[PDB]
Amino acid sequence: HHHMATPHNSAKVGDFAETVLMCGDPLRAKLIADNYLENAKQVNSVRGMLGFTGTYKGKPLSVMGHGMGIPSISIYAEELYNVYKVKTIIRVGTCGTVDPNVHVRDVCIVTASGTDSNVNRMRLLGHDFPATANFEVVSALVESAKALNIPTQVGKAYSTDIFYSKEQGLNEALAQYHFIAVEMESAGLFPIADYYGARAGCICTVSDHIITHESATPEERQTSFQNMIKIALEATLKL
Amino acid sequence: HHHMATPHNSAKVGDFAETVLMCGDPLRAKLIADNYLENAKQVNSVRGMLGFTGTYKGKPLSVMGHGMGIPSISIYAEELYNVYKVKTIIRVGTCGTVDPNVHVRDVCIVTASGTDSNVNRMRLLGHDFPATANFEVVSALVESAKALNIPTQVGKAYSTDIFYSKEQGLNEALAQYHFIAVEMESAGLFPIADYYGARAGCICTVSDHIITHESATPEERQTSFQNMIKIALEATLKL
Amino acid sequence: HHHMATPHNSAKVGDFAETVLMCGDPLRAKLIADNYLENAKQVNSVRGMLGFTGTYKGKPLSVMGHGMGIPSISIYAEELYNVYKVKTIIRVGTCGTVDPNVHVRDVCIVTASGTDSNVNRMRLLGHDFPATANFEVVSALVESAKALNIPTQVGKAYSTDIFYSKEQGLNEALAQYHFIAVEMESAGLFPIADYYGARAGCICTVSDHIITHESATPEERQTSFQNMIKIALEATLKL
Amino acid sequence: HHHMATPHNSAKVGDFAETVLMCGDPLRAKLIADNYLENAKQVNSVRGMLGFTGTYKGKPLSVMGHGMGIPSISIYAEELYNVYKVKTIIRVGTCGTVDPNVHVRDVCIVTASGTDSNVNRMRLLGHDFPATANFEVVSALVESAKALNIPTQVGKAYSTDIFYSKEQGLNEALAQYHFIAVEMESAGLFPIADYYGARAGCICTVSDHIITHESATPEERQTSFQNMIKIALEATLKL
Amino acid sequence: HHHMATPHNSAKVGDFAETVLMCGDPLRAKLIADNYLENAKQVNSVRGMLGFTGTYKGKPLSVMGHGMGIPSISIYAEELYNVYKVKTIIRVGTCGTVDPNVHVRDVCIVTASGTDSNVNRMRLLGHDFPATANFEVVSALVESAKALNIPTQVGKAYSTDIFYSKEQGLNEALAQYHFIAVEMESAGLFPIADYYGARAGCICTVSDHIITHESATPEERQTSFQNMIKIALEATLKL
Amino acid sequence: HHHMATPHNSAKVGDFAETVLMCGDPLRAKLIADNYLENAKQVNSVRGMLGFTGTYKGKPLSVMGHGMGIPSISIYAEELYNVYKVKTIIRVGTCGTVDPNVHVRDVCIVTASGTDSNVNRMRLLGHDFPATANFEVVSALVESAKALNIPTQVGKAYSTDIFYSKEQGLNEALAQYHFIAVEMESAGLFPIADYYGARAGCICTVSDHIITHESATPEERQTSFQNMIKIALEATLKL
Ligand SMILES: Nc1ncnc2[nH]cnc12
Ligand SMILES: Nc1ncnc2[nH]cnc12
Ligand SMILES: Nc1ncnc2[nH]cnc12
Ligand SMILES: Nc1ncnc2[nH]cnc12
Ligand SMILES: Nc1ncnc2[nH]cnc12
Ligand SMILES: Nc1ncnc2[nH]cnc12
Ligand SMILES: [Cl-]
Ligand SMILES: [Cl-]
Ligand SMILES: [Cl-]
Ligand SMILES: [Cl-]
Ligand SMILES: [Cl-]
Ligand SMILES: [Cl-]
């Protein structure tokens, strides 16, 4: 038995760096730690949601899984900002696209995220509350990709509660308004950062074109991941 | 590289029994398999979401984690009913309560679940769609608890997207209408079972009284879990 | 002039039994009293909404009309639970069906009811509040039908405010999710029972198949009614 | 057994006049017929919902009960306009008031009605559809009251689904915006008249002041009714 | 620098008459003042939103532009009723129609207005609040047109936030329920008048048939305007 | 009579530059043209909504008023992007703030805007659609202010339909989530730019602190305007 600083995390207060990368898959968090962090230690394994703290190019950095969907990321991010006193979270993810000018393997940097969830209406008296990335975070991601000569798409994501959509007309509306990324979490993250006066952003790679059915092979997803993670890691040095 | 029958599960079609127990924590799924299943094999580990198939008292039974929140359980349950041809899912969970006559350690059998999620409005043209447990499943749980001489509370749950509620008046309304369990997933499960012409139910143990702040110790949570899981396992023999 | 214990009921406090059957048509309430109750007296005739109190197999039982729609049943049921101190109400009704495996003359026992009304959102801070039958009531109805060798369908109803629907896609969604009964009142009854810590259920007979246009003749509706009412009456002995 | 032209009315097509008065209480419909119509015959008694057709000062006129709430009046009025080819319906009712300058016994002529029902949003793509009385009907009521030297209040009603309101702040908002009448049906009537290219209005007498708790005695309600019904009857001669 | 009695109006308190005509186009307000008012002075030019005060047939009358859309008219009308102590506002506008029996050049007198705006839900606890014209104002407009032998259509308007509609099915629903006028402001005006215990109405001329594409030429719009404005001006003498 | 390319703009197609600054007050548009544009001509005066086209430091640039509120800016911006083929619109405005660390005279660069309007839900199947500024526009504004040594606040705006708010709790929620600017138009602009595959942004100066009641004097508003307009003009050179 270890003392539990939160109901979902056994890390001691102070065991997370002020900057954290988060991805849905805890096994990918372990890969990030093993392949890119130094001075690394595992700080959480509750519910299998692996988290790690170390350094990237000497600067403190943590990485942890967030699970799938807005309610899951909301638990983990609320705890990180509130109990662990984290200042910056960058979600590092995968996404689909409907945009005709976005292609599988593209790197998407998210400026704001729409949603079919109610969580943000509940925060703003039933009104429209845009889940908005912090500008310094967006800029750090854009500038890191430029320095690395990796092209990026910059624009809106859409975070859905329903992976297995049955909703007629949704893809056409997302395309009409140039949503570049379809995923499941970022719209839950940004308002929590706001509540705590903290910062968040999101970068994703396109695994699937929802319209054309193009899909990245395993090797292509590894190459896309390597590009995205290098951008995110370099961006942390500016944050 | 293994063939992926779904984007989130590496099990081969046929590797799940027709009856599945699911809990949020994949590590608890492993405990259930190790302590209660025979003939057991691990059939999934994608995203750390451990799943297992074996037998309980000779009858095929699987157990798998579902993660936290409606979007997470929706992914896993949709796949189980659709691709894996599962017929019955029982969620085996923990919950809070606001009800003045429900106490920590109590076992709650869920007849229907409210929610603050939009997922069910989206299925029924914006209207009220009650997330409703199958009657045969509820009855099997009630009758198994009676045969085991374990008291139960039977009634409504409330599945929220927001573990860290900031909503004034919610607890008072839940208590006024005798909601017995507050959790995060069951309202997403029941309508998916309906879509597939299949069955679902939920049984939870009370870990926390949201009003009085009573909370179960680790030893008390183990005892509650042992009672709940025996009820669920015996119920599968009737299903 | 008689003293009015409520604005809609001239019965004296205590003039209703703790268990009440209610149907939409007050003339059917009179038929139930005349054909199945002993020791019977009329206790209300305000607005023509006939109500009666007597005994069924020696046990106190009342029967009263509720009129058509959620607002009408809400008035009468609120008064019964609050002023008349009733403990159990069973709605005994007729319904349509869209379900391909439900047929005209079938007896449907309701576990929960959806709706297009706002009344339940207004009770639960705008959220989804499932109108849920009490499990002991559902079980008593199921077991009484079994003892009488009368087949039943058990599952969800949908209570609409609009008998003359013009809503495209509604029937297809109701069928997709296996709603067995379409009627107009039960979703208003169950939350009122909850408010008062009391019990409610509903049993209906299928008069019409909304898809195939099959419709019960007058003789068939009498036979269906005789089956349903015997089930409900026998169930009261267990409640 | 009689042929049923609708599921709720045994009147033969043509048995209703083109102008119909409707009140909630079928027993009050009988009183109106007995005391004010000549050449009168009962044309419906299904569900006890008495309806009558005769003449008032030589002009064809019917009167029928509508029951309590929007779903009930919607059934009866839809049938009257569609099957019975009625052209004008005037609801003749009772109401409460919150308005500080409206008093018990006052006669209120309704120009439009708000609601907490969803029925009108469902007709207009989810938008705000004002339930609006026909101007010729309103004018006929106003001018008849003037000729009879009976004072009237003219303005908005509010039609609620919930007689037993638990809603904090509702009365204060209704008063702030000068709603003169609180009742349960008119907002359902006016849009149905619109659908059929027909006309509707409403006149009510104040039985209760919701704020001060003033309440009309039985004798006072009879006097108020006599004033209101004379206004409505005289108005039919202009319609 | 002049003292600003409101943030949008430089008129001194008392510089507006108790009765005000308002139109969207400030240049049309100037035309009305120049061609129909005597004793006229310009009292506002902030934001170009010209307003004037003078007399019509000896009676004090003002005219001012209101701009386009509910938020714009709401600013100006709130200020007029609150700061300037205005008692009656008549909107004098143009509109489209979908109604098959309404034609270009017709004069429409508005009894109530629907909307796709949220402003009225926000005033009435999320419910349906009909934006309703004052009956004395409607009657004054109707009677003035009759005395001038100018035909009118009387009925509902629909005030939209979106001139450039992309909404499938809207026109068909508006036609089904006999909305006579499509415009952008009146639904915002009427509830503000209510808040202040004051009066409002609206009269419009049909510039365009939304279905047939008929459109008034410039000369036809001038003739329609001359008819409408004479009706409105004469109506002010009765108010 | 001039040909009207749109119902609200007499400019000939081609008479607007590809980049346009817009402000609410047409008189401020004239001031911008007179004081900062060369080669300038007035291209619109319909409804007094002055618009001008010229050059700023040799590059084509237009400036036009947009009026007050989402419906007004939506008309003008839709026309500019669609008929006039504009590529970039920057709203140059004033705002209030509730943020404790934002002060009167501050320059706010908007990354996204919330709203109480329905216009964006109507574009995205009822879901949350964030009104999001284009990143290149935001960056151009930020970098221009830096080069000019003018401090800026960067973050979310809130666009309301109701200048005269009566909404309890709104300011506290806006402050909790660090909304920096309260205004009335930007949330309508950004989705229209998206529809046309075009770009938009917004920069405002704080005229009023909604909490402390601090308010800029006329001289202070002129100084703030001079800072903001120089930032916007310099940003156009990068766009
Ligand atoms: N198509 C998709 N939909 C939702 N979330 C996703 N994450 C990756 N691809 C996705
Ligand atoms: N208090 C609580 N709220 C939500 N989900 C829970 N699961 C267990 N306890 C819970
Ligand atoms: N088709 C139907 N729709 C609604 N309520 C009903 N009650 C009986 N049949 C019905
Ligand atoms: N107070 C009230 N509320 C609702 N409907 C009514 N009808 C008469 N009085 C009423
Ligand atoms: N077609 C139309 N739509 C909206 N407002 C209008 N005003 C005049 N014509 C209109
Ligand atoms: N306080 C305020 N509210 C809304 N819009 C504004 N524009 C400038 N100040 C404002
Ligand atoms: Cl996924
Ligand atoms: Cl949890
Ligand atoms: Cl019916
Ligand atoms: Cl009543
Ligand atoms: Cl217009
Ligand atoms: Cl303003």
| Domain harbouring A142, CATH code | 3.40.50.1580
- Chain B neighbours (≥3 Cβ pairs under 8 A) are A, C
Q: Which ligand is nearest to the CA of D49?
A: 9
- Are residues A65 and A26 in contact, defined by beta-carbon separation less than 8 angstroms? yes
Compute the distance from residue E197 Cα to the ligand 12 centre, in Å. Answer: 25
Q: B34-38: which pairs have CB atoms within 8 A and are 24 or more residues apart?
A: B36/B229, B36/B233, B37/B61, B37/B63
- Are residues E185 and E74 in contact, defined by beta-carbon separation less than 8 angstroms? no
Distance CA A164, CA A167 (A): 9
Q: Is residue F13 part of a domain?
A: no
Q: Which residues line ligand 5 (CB under 6 A)?
A: E 94-96, 160, 163, 182-184, 207-208, 210
Atom of ligand 1 nearest to the CA of A184: 5
Q: Is residue F84 part of a domain?
A: yes
Technique used by the depositors: X-ray
Subunit contact C164:D75, Cβ cutoff 8 A: yes
Which member of E8, E68, E123 has the closest CB to residue F72? E68
Which chain A residues contact residue F139 at CB under 8 A? 139
Q: Which residues of E are annotated as a binding site?
A: 8, 91, 184-185, 208
Query: Where is E111: in which H helix or E strand?
Result: strand E107-115
| Mutation for testing the E interface, residue in D81, D127, D139 having most E CBs under 10 Å | D127
Distance CA A114, CA F113 (A): 12
Query: Where is B93: in which H helix or E strand?
Result: strand B88-97
SS3 F21: strand
* Phi (first) and psi of residue E72, to 5 degrees: -70, -55
Compute the distance from residue F183 Cα to the ligand 6 centre, in Å. Answer: 5
- Chain C neighbours (≥3 Cβ pairs under 8 A) are B, D
- Are residues A62 and A48 in contact, defined by beta-carbon separation less than 8 angstroms? no
SS3 F132: strand
- Are residues F16 and F43 in contact, defined by beta-carbon separation less than 8 angstroms? yes
Q: Is residue E169 part of a domain?
A: yes
Enclosing domain of residue E179: 19-236
A24 Cβ under 8 Å from any chain B Cβ: yes
Q: Is residue C94 part of a domain?
A: yes
Which chain C residues contact residue B174 at CB under 8 A? 124
Residue of A184, A206, A224 to test ligand 1 pocket, by largest number of atoms within 8 Å of CB: A184
Of D191, C166, D155, residue with least CA distance to E156: D191
Residue numbers after which chain A breaks, C to N beyond 2.5 angstroms: none
Of F105, C24, C28, E76, residue with least CA distance to D69: C24
Question: B179 to chain C, minimum CA–CA distance in Å?
Answer: 9
Q: E176-180: which pairs have CB atoms within 8 A and are 24 or more residues apart?
A: E176/D194, E176/D195, E177/D123, E177/D124, E177/D129, E177/D191, E177/D194, E177/D195, E178/D194, E178/D197, E178/E99, E179/E98, E179/E99, E179/E114, E179/E155, E180/E97, E180/E99, E180/E102, E180/E108, E180/E153, E180/E154, E180/E155, E180/E156
Q: How far is CA A143 from CA A135, A149, A228, in A?
A: 12, 10, 13
- Are residues A87 and A130 in contact, defined by beta-carbon separation less than 8 angstroms? no
Ligand 3 neighbourhood includes C185 CB (under 6 angstroms): no
A70 Cβ under 8 Å from any chain B Cβ: yes
Distance CA A156, CA A173 (A): 13
Q: Which ligand is nearest to the CA of A74?
A: 8
Instruction: Report whether F91 belongs to an annotated binding site.
Output: yes
F164 Cβ under 8 Å from any chain E Cβ: yes
How large is the C-alpha radius of gyration of chain E? 17
How big is the A-F interface in CB pairs under 8 Å? 106
Which chain D residues contact residue E176 at CB under 8 A? 194-195
Q: Is residue C185 part of a domain?
A: yes
Q: Is residue A1 part of a domain?
A: no
Compute the distance from residue B50 Cα to the ligand 3 centre, in Å. Answer: 47
F133-162 residues touching A, CB cutoff 8 A: 133, 135, 138-139, 142, 154-156
Of A48, A32, A38, A162, residue with least CA distance to A96: A162
Tokens of D115: 């609601």
Q: Is residue D7 part of a domain?
A: no
Amino acid at A91: R
Tokens of F23: 């402000």
Distance CA E17, CA B70 (A): 59
Distance CA F224, CA F234 (A): 16
- For residue E35, give every residue at least 6 positions away whose Cβ sits within 8 Å of its Cβ, in sequence order, or none: none
Q: How far is CA A7 from CA A2, A74, B93, D219, in A?
A: 12, 13, 15, 66
Residue B208 designated active-site: yes
- Are residues C37 and C61 in contact, defined by beta-carbon separation less than 8 angstroms? yes
Residue of D25, D208, D211 to test ligand 4 pocket, by largest number of atoms within 8 Å of CB: D208
Catalytic positions of A, written as ranges: 208
Measured between CA atoms, the residue of chain B closest to residue A45 is B27
- Are residues E135 and D155 in contact, defined by beta-carbon separation less than 8 angstroms? yes
* Phi (first) and psi of residue F191, to 5 degrees: -70, -25
- Are residues D89 and D205 in contact, defined by beta-carbon separation less than 8 angstroms? no
Which member of F113, F125, F174 has the closest CB to residue A130? F113
Q: E229-232: which pairs have CB atoms within 8 A and are 24 or more residues apart?
A: E229/E32, E229/E36, E229/E92, E230/E144, E230/E148, E230/E150, E231/E107, E231/E141, E231/E144, E231/E145, E231/E148, E231/E150, E231/E152, E231/E203, E232/E21, E232/E90, E232/E92, E232/E141, E232/E144, E232/E203
Using CA of residue B85, residue B90, residue B92, residue B95, what is the dihedral sign?
Answer: positive
Resolution in A: 1.2
Q: Is residue C149 part of a domain?
A: yes
Ligand 6 neighbourhood includes F208 CB (under 6 angstroms): yes
Query: Where is F44: in which H helix or E strand?
Result: strand F38-44
Q: C169 — alpha (psi -120 to 50), left (phi > 0) or beta? A: left
Helix axes B70-82, B186-195, angle to 10 degrees: 30
Tokens of A112: 């704001």
Q: Which residues of E are annotated as a binding site for adenosine?
A: 8, 91, 184-185, 208
- Chain F neighbours (≥3 Cβ pairs under 8 A) are A, E
Amino acid at A223: T
Tokens of C73: 């049943």
Distance CA F50, CA C205 (A): 69
User: With the CA atoms of A65, A71, A74 and A75 taken in that order, what torsion angle do they form, in degrees rounded to the nearest 10?
Assistant: -70
Percentages helix, strand, coil for chain A (3-state, rounded to 5) are 35, 30, 35
Instruction: Report whether C208 belongs to an annotated binding site.
Output: yes
Give how many domains chain C has, as a whole number. Answer: 1
